[PDB]
Amino acid sequence: VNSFSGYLKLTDNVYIKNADIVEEAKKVKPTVVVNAANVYLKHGGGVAGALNKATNNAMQVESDDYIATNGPLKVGGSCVLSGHNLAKHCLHVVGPNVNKGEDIQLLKSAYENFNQHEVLLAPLLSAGIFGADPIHSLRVCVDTVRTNVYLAVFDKNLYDKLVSSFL
Numbered sequence: 001v002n003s004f005s006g007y008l009k010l011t012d013n014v015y016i017k018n019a020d021i022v023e024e025a026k027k028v029k030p031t032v033v034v035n036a037a038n039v040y041l042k043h044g045g046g047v048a049g050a051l052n053k054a055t056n057n058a059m060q061v062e063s064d065d066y067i068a069t070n071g072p073l074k075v076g077g078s079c080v081l082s083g084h085n086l087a088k089h090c091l092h093v094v095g096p097n098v099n100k101g102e103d104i105q106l107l108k109s110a111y112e113n114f115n116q117h118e119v120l121l122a123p124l125l126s127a128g129i130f131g132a133d134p135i136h137s138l139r140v141c142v143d144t145v146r147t148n149v150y151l152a153v154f155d156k157n158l159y160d161k162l163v164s165s166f167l
């Protein structure tokens with residue numbers, strides 16, 4: 001038993017809700033919140049800009065030190081950093097950005113990072129400003145993640161569509 005509430009169950013291990021991940025994170029304090037990161041951990045907009053704003057820019061400060069030490073992430077890769085006031089940990093995962101021409105097949109590799117964590121609160125990778133089809137992203141999520149994932153979908157219209165079209 002865990003503290004996530006109001007989710008619809010899609011599969012044995014995947015759950016979905018219409019929610020603001022920042023507010024969902026603020027109430028649940030999950031062990032892991034996933035950020036829709038880029039390779040530079042520049043949290044300017046989308047989910048990343050919202051999560052970072054909710055941390056009063058502490059996420060960005062921590063991220064800049066991470067990059068200065070380690071260099072950029074790989075597309076499809078991830079790193080674990082602090083969850084600040086939102087979660088114990090933040091798993092920064094880089095899905096491919098279609099608006100940069102990145103290979104959508106890397107989306108499966110991106111979701112594989114979730115399997116290193118037993119339970120996660122997450123957005124749909126490569127959705128939103130990353131330019132992928134959220135329905136495809138949901139399919140890859142279901143077919144790749146084996147751990148327990150609670151997907152927060154900000155847009156109510158999109159949430160309803162994802163549910164109605166789910167196979």
Ligand SMILES: COC(=O)[C@]1(CO)CCN(c2ncnc3[nH]c4cc(F)ccc4c23)C1
Nearest residue numbers: 020021046047050123127128129152153154
């Ligand atoms: C149509 O696709 C989308 O909604 C996205 C657009 O890039 C992709 C994923 N995403 C989010 N997903 C779950 N919670 C979210 N809270 C947010 C707060 C913000 F200020 C901005 C975005 C989100 C957000 C936004």
